[PDB]
Design a protein around this ligand. Structure first.
Ligand SMILES: CO[C@@H]1O[C@H](CO)[C@@H](O[C@@H]2O[C@H](CO)[C@@H](O[C@@H]3O[C@H](CO)[C@@H](O[C@@H]4O[C@H](CO)[C@@H](O)[C@H](O)[C@H]4NC(C)=O)[C@H](O[C@H](C)C(=O)O)[C@H]3NC(C)=O)[C@H](O)[C@H]2NC(C)=O)[C@H](O[C@H](C)C(=O)O)[C@H]1NC(C)=O
Ligand SMILES: [Zn+2]
Ligand SMILES: [Zn+2]
Lengths: 241, 241
């Protein structure tokens, strides 16, 4: 097109533009999700339906930019849309009780659809486990999906995401000696894991949101964002894979 | 067990992964540039030769990631490789002589090859003028290409990069009244233009590198990074997108 172009040669120094995979849930049923993701203000490359077997919809090819992430950061990479593949999952989200928050679990059909997909996408694009991540991770104070009911442990089992090895955990809390590290330490470990986090040494929402997000992934029994001893053990036992 | 893909539906809410175009020079001749950019561990999507007419080489599809930018930021977007198209130009960069530093000018053949290319790339990817930028911009003080001899004015004339209108400068100097703004102000205007810059009121190399980079683009007669009145006029007269 236009001036004298030469296409004889091809660089060996070549790569995928896609570095991350961001997991989501839709907060809507399958019919509404299709509309929103095709003609809403938002989009994802894939949409995993509810049925058995769970049907996966390619709505945007992995070559173009889907609008799923918004304002985002992971491992210092900002605005992840352009550098990522978004995967939405039809799931109803959460509800509020007076004693905290409850969530709809994911159908098993959708999980067994999700794993093969992630393996295939990760292989083609050479994406590592530490870059297959949730929306709650890339925007901790703003997002919370796919939530504490996402079976990361299953993805870990398929080798798709980081997870501590047996008794790595138990060894790490043995090292801590019962002494809880200070906020600044937690902030260091979180940034090291890839999270955007304040380095102040203070525990404001911003720092609490981020610790809360990490807890949701690896210790969803509680994720109030309150510095715990177990959380510290995870911050050391969890791989950077 | 497993999924199956449905591609019946396709989202209207998608665009290009490529948001920026980064300009470079090679600091070496055409034969060596071809080797380096195809088998050197640095790459660019395009290479504009020094022949006449200038031959443009596609070495990496605009679909894949070329390794040209490295550690980078523009308008808060970090690590630009994955989100950008790199264009190298055969040009010896600079040389360090007994009579100062000398920069090699660009052949006019390569400029007339460059413009059509940039128009074509910008059209297909919907990239705005403020996102067609030099390497010196995305890493001030670490990088300095394509240098003060790059005719941004010509690109401005083709509508490819931001540039002040005929009466704009002169009107901006008139507003300034001869009173030079403080470092903090310059730092505010630079960050506003997309540069990674300190906000600390200090005039260290870090802040000086960035103002120097801006001077190189819009006022290359001098780019010491020293706050100018003329520079301030540019920081106001120059379009921001
Ligand atoms: C228009 O499209 C839809 O809207 C949004 C996109 O524009 C988007 O909604 C966003 O949804 C998320 C989760 O669904 C929601 O999350 C809340 O944000 C903060 C940060 O997590 C929470 O703060 C927690 O506070 C408590 C108490 O201290 C702690 O226990 C916890 O540690 C804190 N932080 C954590 C966990 O990280 C907040 O809880 C507050 C306190 C509250 O309930 O009052 C979060 N909720 C939960 C359940 O924890 C967020 O507010 C919301 N806002 C945005 C993005 O700005 C929808 O999501 C996607 C795109 C999708 O589902 O497709 C959009 N789409 C749909 C279909 O709804
Ligand atoms: Zn989401
Ligand atoms: Zn360069």
């Amino acid at each position: 097109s236009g001036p004298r172009l030469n296409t004889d040669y091809t660089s060996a120094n070549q790569d995928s533009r896609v570095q991350f995979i961001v997991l989501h849930y839709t907060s809507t049923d399958l019919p509404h999700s299709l509309g929103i993701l095709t003609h809403g203000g938002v989009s994802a490359h894939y949409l995993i339906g509810d049925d058995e077997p769970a049907t996966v919809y390619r709505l945007v090819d992995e070559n173009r930019r889907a609008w799923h992430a918004g304002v985002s950061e992971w491992q210092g990479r900002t605005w992840l849309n352009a550098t990522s593949i978004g995967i939405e999952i039809v799931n109803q989200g959460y509800r509020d009780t007076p004693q905290g928050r409850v969530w709809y679990p994911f159908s098993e059909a959708q999980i067994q659809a999700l794993i093969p997909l992630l393996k295939d996408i990760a292989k083609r694009h050479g994406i590592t486990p530490d870059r297959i991540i949730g929306h709650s991770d890339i925007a901790p104070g703003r997002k919370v999906d796919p939530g504490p009911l996402f079976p990361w442990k299953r993805l870990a089992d398929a080798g798709l995401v980081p997870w501590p090895k047996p008794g790595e955990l138990a060894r790490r809390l043995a090292e801590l000696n019962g002494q809880l590290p200070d906020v600044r330490w937690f902030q260091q470990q979180l940034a090291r894991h890839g999270y955007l986090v304040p380095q102040t040494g203070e525990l404001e929402k911003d720092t609490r949101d981020v610790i809360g997000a990490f807890q949701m992934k690896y210790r969803p029994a509680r994720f109030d964002g309150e510095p715990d001893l177990e959380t510290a053990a995870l911050l050391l036992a969890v791989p950077t894979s």
